[PDB]
Amino acid sequence: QYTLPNNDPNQGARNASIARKRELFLYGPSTLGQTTFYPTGELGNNISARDVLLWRQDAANQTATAYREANETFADITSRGGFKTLDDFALLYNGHWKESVPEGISKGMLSNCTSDLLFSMERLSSNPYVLKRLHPTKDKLPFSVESKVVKKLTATTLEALHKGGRLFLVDHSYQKKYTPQPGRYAAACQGLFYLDARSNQFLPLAIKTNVGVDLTYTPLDDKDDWLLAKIMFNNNDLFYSQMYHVLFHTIPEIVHEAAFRTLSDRHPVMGVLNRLMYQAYAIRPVGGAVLFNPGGFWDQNFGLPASAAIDFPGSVYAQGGGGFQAGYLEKDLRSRGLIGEDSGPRLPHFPFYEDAHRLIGAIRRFMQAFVDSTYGADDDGALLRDYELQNWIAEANGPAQVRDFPAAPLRRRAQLVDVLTHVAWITGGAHHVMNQGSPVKFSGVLPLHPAALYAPIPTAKGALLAWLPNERQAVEQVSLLARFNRAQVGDRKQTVRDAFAAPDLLAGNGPGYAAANARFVEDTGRISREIAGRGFDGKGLSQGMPFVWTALNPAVNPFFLSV
Amino acid sequence: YTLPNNDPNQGARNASIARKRELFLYGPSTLGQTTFYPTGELGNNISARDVLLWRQDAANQTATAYREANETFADITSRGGFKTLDDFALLYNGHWKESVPEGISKGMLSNCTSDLLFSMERLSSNPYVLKRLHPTKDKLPFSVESKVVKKLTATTLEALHKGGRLFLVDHSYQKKYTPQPGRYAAACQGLFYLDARSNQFLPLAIKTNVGVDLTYTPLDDKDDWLLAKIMFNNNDLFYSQMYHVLFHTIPEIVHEAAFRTLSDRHPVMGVLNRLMYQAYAIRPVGGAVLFNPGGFWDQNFGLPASAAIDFPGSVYAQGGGGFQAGYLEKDLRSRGLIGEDSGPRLPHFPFYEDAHRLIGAIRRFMQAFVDSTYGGALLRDYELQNWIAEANGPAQVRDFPAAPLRRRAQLVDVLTHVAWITGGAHHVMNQGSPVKFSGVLPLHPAALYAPIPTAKLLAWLPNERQAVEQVSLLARFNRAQVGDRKQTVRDAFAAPDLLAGNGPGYAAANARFVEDTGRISREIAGRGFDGKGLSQGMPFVWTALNPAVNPFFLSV
Amino acid sequence: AFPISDITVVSERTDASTAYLSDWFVVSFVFSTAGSDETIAGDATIEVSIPNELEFVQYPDSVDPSVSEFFTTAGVQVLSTAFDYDSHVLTFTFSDPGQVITDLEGVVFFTLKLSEQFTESASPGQHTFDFETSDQTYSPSVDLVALDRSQPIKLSNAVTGGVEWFVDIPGAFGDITNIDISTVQTPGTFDCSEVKYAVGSSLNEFGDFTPQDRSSGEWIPITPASGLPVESFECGDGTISLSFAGELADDEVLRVSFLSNLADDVLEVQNVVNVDLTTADALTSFVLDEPFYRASRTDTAAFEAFAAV
């Protein structure tokens, strides 16, 4: 039922249907920011509207549930007198959100919230896409610290830590360009981290606000000053993750657009891409209508206005970001210096990389068997003579204007396997680290991770609940992030393990497809049992961290870009 | 509060209006395509303030309703769910005691099979769509087998038509819309007639206008006719909820024009601000939680929120929503429902009766208010003339009195109509009417869950969870707190800052209004069934215009 | 054959009848007297043929390991041995001029390898070796078993250098999620430019596979720059540390190869490999201390009883 065009008798009719798709499914202007073309035309609008319909019916249950459990949560907090201290923020979570967030929020995220190791390790797990190692000579120190502070904190110097390849940087200073909404405040933090030889641990060193009087904090500051510095950084990091992942939505969309304009609907790769891009064309329309509109959910809850949120992924794209091959797992991490001994020592623990490496392994095994089943050989003339595939590549590189896509002509199976692996990895993995249930479980857990700051950025070293949301605002943050989660994915059979198990794909693709599918189901069964069984060792650590991180669990995540 | 005519600080008074005009702007229409909505810094600030007041004033009701919904669902599931159609009483008997304290309508459950109850709803719980068929200017909608017509009515369609006795509710415009997956809908037309034998308004026929396009009558099988009424009520609920958007957006644009022209210390502006309390919350809140994709409308109604939002803009795009066209007597006699020119009189028009009393009280107060303010002095109130000119010009208000406004009766008309909408017309369609009358299950389902029949019934109605969710939403449209907050219609003009800030004539008028609406509210609260089981001539007790129950403002 | 009472063959690795095709086989010649033959020794020779499948292994290239003198535990000369490489006959020659030996108790053994010619076409399992004397044939038996794929194993391979070590991790153990490996050895020097790994899923009838160079797997070098599955990698002159995180399939074997260059005057190498496996639902440790040997070996202190007239 799905076949290649190479030996198709009805090739001229197949060509005709493609030519008619190309008249009705058109590249339109970028929406939801300025990145990638969004489909327009009669057929592109029909597809967009079908996806919005499916999304509408799939969001009802989770939305209603989240509002109900938010109303209950607020009744409980209010009845207990509200927040008198930072520990009462646990009332926001204990015993609540059982239906919206069945797995609960991160084990250890509340108990150990003041832990510096937990604050540094988040940059290698919850949001691993920003951290970057400082090259000893090709990068300079972003900011300076009083060397007496550096010596008492690290037992060495910034110069020596830099020369030794042990300094790492998170740079959110670009958010200096934005102005908070009135009654809201925000910094533009740069965080400096280091790998400590004394303990073999990735640790926080300093935080520079880059706003106002521009203070620099350290774990040697007063307790509340350092804690508040970490809160400001977490605010900037939340803004970053939420708005950079727009690109995790728009790079797949454009790759699928170019494919839909060139591959036959009966092409086996078209069917797998359609499966992975399930409902994907809803995210820009829905987000534009309720999330980033004037007074929408973003404006209601976050510090920076929706206009700044929407400007950020376009600025990234305008500076050259969002390359397709640039985003392959190891290519990305190696470009940031996070894999192996790269002009410095090896990170002892990179939980995102390890979980990612396992899951991507399962996906790549499947994709390899899928490509071999379709084209029939070993690790390539059948690929070269698939004019639909070659058209897809030319179309991507040309009219669709995809960045950093494998050049045409595509000569090696390994290239196609890379493309298909990276798409499945975005929709069933990378997306769910930044968005999906990750903000409610890890990235946006109060009090350490507030969507907005409610008191002005300090001007000296003195200080608290005043920067943090009040009871209603806190419930409203947890309620929005709970609305990014999808508790029903399991019963809907829309989990990452079921990604390739669509009945029409099993019925129309051939025996090799179904064998690769069964191996993928068993592999992701192993991976999901490993992740769900996670807990703390004898040092209170999980993957070297004071919290349990499960964002890449294939039994919990959907196989598509669901929010 | 003071007219500009003799204000010593008239220069600063003008300057404040210049500033407001520079910061409070007409913006693109939201919640559909009807009427401008305020942008600019001051408009954003007023919008946000109303939205915050609205959320604060919604907390109690939504939390209460959530826990009562969980109670109702636990009890229904423990009692074995719906097996009979009579099992829907489980949904209401002994539940929703705080979120709907007055209970749902007396008789709506016990007499739910009554044809008189079904037809009399078009003259009470939603009176805005029925229309008399003119003998020669309007044609019959469809055919009905003459045999059936004679058995039912003892006469013929042509005789009823010629004698001005045929009435129509046409919902076939909804055939333009496609229901959400797993839900279904008709595009019904209901034909009703004023039976000369019994002097009762009665149903004659219902035509679905979908599929095989069947036509039901009360002579059909029990479940076929009953399902016809159910489908009609489903269309009628869509209409009432989506058409009442104009009850929000037309007062809004009048108040936007007023806010850009009247001083804040103008007495008409103080009365308009009191009536439009929280009004600018309704479109943003409704956009964020009601008609957002996957919100409460999607969760409950058969048609998606996109079609819902399309409907008021369609009404508007065809000349609906005229301000003066909405005046109670103008509307009812445009539709041939009142006026002896139109035909034989309806013996019972509950909505017209209660509306005529209530609008009488409002109008008497407004006429005393205009007299207190003005006494000539109308034409010299250049802020007022600026309001009329602005409403007809930039604000694009439709069918507003032309500028210059010369007679006091025109201003009395405007203020009376605005008060009538925020204190009365809104609450017939919205507020607590859906949960008490318009959307009572099983006769008034928000969605149908089975395909429309193709030949001559729990499969169509919601299940246990979906029924509980419908009563939950409709119960969250109610505000059980309006009495304790002193925000009823009886309190409409008794604001301290208004009483104090206006004048003695104002306070005299207000005490008059409180007396009148007290009489009205006791009258409506004393209603019950007489010797023949009727209230206002209907098999149920309709109370949606009670001034001691309704809010004075467009609250949800 | 007197005074030969028995000829036994076991694996030096297992010390029993189970052996790999790659094993050193201890071929033991038991000498006893319990009748009252005189054994015409010294002057006397005992010829025993070695089956062609067994071979002496020579290191250095010029030293014949079969040529030796054998003594009592107290140091008395008893006999000397030499092997004919053309006829495959081992000759024992006593060193006692016209002088009857009354008592003889001892064991002469040599360590042999199986020939290539035999192992190319060999099949599991049981194989008997035929040693012919003059009055009797001795036929000890050994089971040629396939590689143990139920736990981590260690394998030696002589190369021009030269030991290549193999550490095999069978996926059919876990459940395997993490693998920790460390090796220490004296006196070799590890070549850190030559650490590599492969993952194979085929396996032949002897449980083995041959990874292909850049079915069976592909050899993948391990450098500081390498990423997952490599979690960590230290290589010093006498020690290597290595760690893996990844999914080892039930039908797969991870094979780590590390080369050790040796001085030419080295004949024997001590080597341990600790392997710790982490398996979902614990931590299982293994020690693999099998040495490496370059040549056929014996023990000259071979006889416990000896007496002549």
Ligand SMILES: *[C@@H]1O[C@H](CO)[C@@H](O[C@@H]2O[C@H](CO)[C@@H](O[C@@H]3O[C@H](CO)[C@@H](O)[C@H](O)[C@H]3NC(C)=O)[C@H](O)[C@H]2NC(C)=O)[C@H](O)[C@H]1NC(C)=O
């Ligand atoms: C469906 O669309 C395909 C893509 O447009 C067509 O592929 C084209 O087919 C042509 C005929 O097979 C190829 O022609 C080549 O060039 C000349 C033409 O002037 C011939 O003599 C050559 O022998 C021929 N083959 C070569 C050079 O190997 C086109 O090159 C080819 N285009 C692409 C992009 O692959 C299909 O033909 C078309 N199928 C049908 C049934 O219409």
Ligand SMILES: *[C@@H]1O[C@H](CO)[C@@H](O)[C@H](O[C@@H]2O[C@H](CO)[C@@H](O)[C@H](O)[C@H]2NC(C)=O)[C@H]1NC(C)=O
């Ligand atoms: C609203 O919620 C409050 C508690 O949050 C609850 O007390 C209200 O009930 C009413 O409170 C009034 C006090 O302001 C009281 O006079 C009134 O009798 C009481 N009514 C009932 C039925 O409990 C809640 N509902 C309101 C204010 O209508």
Ligand SMILES: *[C@@H]1O[C@H](CO)[C@@H](O[C@@H]2O[C@H](CO)[C@@H](O)[C@H](O)[C@H]2NC(C)=O)[C@H](O)[C@H]1NC(C)=O
């Ligand atoms: C809303 O979503 C929840 C979660 O998927 C649904 O609850 C599941 O319903 C299926 C249907 O039989 C059961 O098999 C599961 O056991 C339920 N899971 C849980 C955690 O309760 C619920 O039914 C959905 N509600 C609606 C109206 O669709």
Ligand SMILES: *[C@@H]1O[C@H](CO)[C@@H](O[C@@H]2O[C@H](CO)[C@@H](O)[C@H](O)[C@H]2NC(C)=O)[C@H](O)[C@H]1NC(C)=O
């Ligand atoms: C992170 O939090 C977890 C859970 O709150 C801590 O684990 C608990 O530690 C206490 C004392 O060490 C034990 O009595 C509990 O039994 C542990 N709970 C679990 C579920 O294991 C952990 O110690 C914290 N880690 C750090 C570094 O502070």
Ligand SMILES: *[C@@H]1O[C@H](CO)[C@@H](O[C@@H]2O[C@H](CO)[C@@H](O)[C@H](O)[C@H]2NC(C)=O)[C@H](O)[C@H]1NC(C)=O
């Ligand atoms: C406040 O506004 C009015 C309207 O512009 C000002 O002026 C009078 O406007 C009327 C229109 O109703 C004109 O007919 C008159 O000519 C205007 N009066 C003049 C020019 O004296 C009024 O002056 C303003 N108040 C102040 C204090 O400037």
Ligand SMILES: *[C@@H]1O[C@H](CO)[C@@H](O)[C@H](O)[C@H]1NC(C)=O
């Ligand atoms: C788009 O959808 C409409 C309604 O389903 C249909 O009439 C039209 O043919 C569609 N156009 C396409 C699929 O190109």
Ligand SMILES: *[C@@H]1O[C@H](CO)[C@@H](O)[C@H](O)[C@H]1NC(C)=O
């Ligand atoms: C309660 O639910 C309503 C919707 O029913 C929502 O608007 C409101 O924000 C919720 N309350 C809280 C405290 O989140």
Ligand SMILES: *[C@@H]1O[C@H](CO)[C@@H](O)[C@H](O)[C@H]1NC(C)=O
């Ligand atoms: C709008 O609100 C902000 C925040 O309170 C305030 O600073 C500003 O002055 C307001 N604008 C107007 C026109 O009142």
Ligand SMILES: *[C@@H]1O[C@H](CO)[C@@H](O)[C@H](O)[C@H]1NC(C)=O
């Ligand atoms: C509340 O009600 C919903 C359905 O209305 C039900 O699924 C849920 O389990 C209930 N929760 C509790 C705590 O009873």
Ligand SMILES: *[C@@H]1O[C@H](CO)[C@@H](O)[C@H](O)[C@H]1NC(C)=O
């Ligand atoms: C309507 O219901 C009420 C209460 O159940 C009953 O007393 C009355 O007789 C009913 N009226 C008719 C006309 O059936």
Ligand SMILES: [Mn+2]
């Ligand atoms: Mn997303």
Ligand SMILES: [Mn+2]
């Ligand atoms: Mn309303």
